[PDB]
Design a protein around this motif. Structure first.
Motif, PDB file in Angstrom:
ATOM      1  N   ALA A  28       0.820  -1.336  -0.067  1.00  0.00           N
ATOM      2  CA  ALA A  28      -0.078  -0.023   0.145  1.00  0.00           C
ATOM      3  C   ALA A  28       0.981   1.301  -0.024  1.00  0.00           C
ATOM      4  O   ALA A  28       1.069   1.788   0.983  1.00  0.00           O
ATOM      5  CB  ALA A  28      -0.919  -0.058   1.109  1.00  0.00           C
ATOM      6  N   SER A  29       1.224   1.684  -1.175  1.00  0.00           N
ATOM      7  CA  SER A  29       2.186   2.672  -1.334  1.00  0.00           C
ATOM      8  C   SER A  29       1.698   3.912  -1.761  1.00  0.00           C
ATOM      9  O   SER A  29       2.008   5.186  -1.449  1.00  0.00           O
ATOM     10  CB  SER A  29       3.410   2.204  -2.386  1.00  0.00           C
ATOM     11  OG  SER A  29       4.370   1.436  -1.680  1.00  0.00           O
ATOM     12  N   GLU A  30       0.795   4.073  -2.730  1.00  0.00           N
ATOM     13  CA  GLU A  30      -0.191   5.152  -3.522  1.00  0.00           C
ATOM     14  C   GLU A  30      -1.567   4.940  -3.493  1.00  0.00           C
ATOM     15  O   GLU A  30      -1.688   3.646  -3.756  1.00  0.00           O
ATOM     16  CB  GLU A  30       0.592   5.400  -4.930  1.00  0.00           C
ATOM     17  CG  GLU A  30       2.183   5.739  -4.669  1.00  0.00           C
ATOM     18  CD  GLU A  30       2.543   7.018  -4.094  1.00  0.00           C
ATOM     19  OE1 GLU A  30       1.627   8.262  -4.544  1.00  0.00           O
ATOM     20  OE2 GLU A  30       3.123   7.265  -3.077  1.00  0.00           O
ATOM     21  N   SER A  31      -2.236   6.013  -3.285  1.00  0.00           N
ATOM     22  CA  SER A  31      -3.543   5.920  -3.247  1.00  0.00           C
ATOM     23  C   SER A  31      -4.007   6.843  -4.910  1.00  0.00           C
ATOM     24  O   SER A  31      -3.325   7.695  -5.277  1.00  0.00           O
ATOM     25  CB  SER A  31      -4.264   6.697  -2.370  1.00  0.00           C
ATOM     26  OG  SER A  31      -4.045   8.182  -2.432  1.00  0.00           O
TER      27      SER A  31
END
Lengths: 48, 48
Positions: A28-31
């Motif tokens: 979960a690195s970027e939205s």
């Protein structure tokens, strides 16, 4: 003529090389949010 | 020096200012027919 005067030099030079890299990313690195689309009419080179 | 020779003068000036009108109507006058509003659309750029 080749007569060496009382002075020395140092030279500098810059080169560049193309390389192959390697990427690692977490879970979960970027939205990410994506939007909608819009159309634009315009006089083209021959048409629209 | 203040000598008054054999001559007289007359001076003219001009001024300006705003005023109201206070008109009267006297009803039973112009009919002023009206009707049939018309809309005219035409694309120029981006939208209409």
């Amino acid at each position: 003529t080749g007569f060496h005067p009382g002075i020395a030099f140092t030279v500098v030079r810059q080169d560049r090389f193309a390389t192959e890299q390697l990427l690692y990313a977490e879970r979960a690195s970027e939205s990410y949010f994506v939007g909608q689309i819009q159309v634009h009419h315009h006089d083209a080179i021959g048409g629209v």
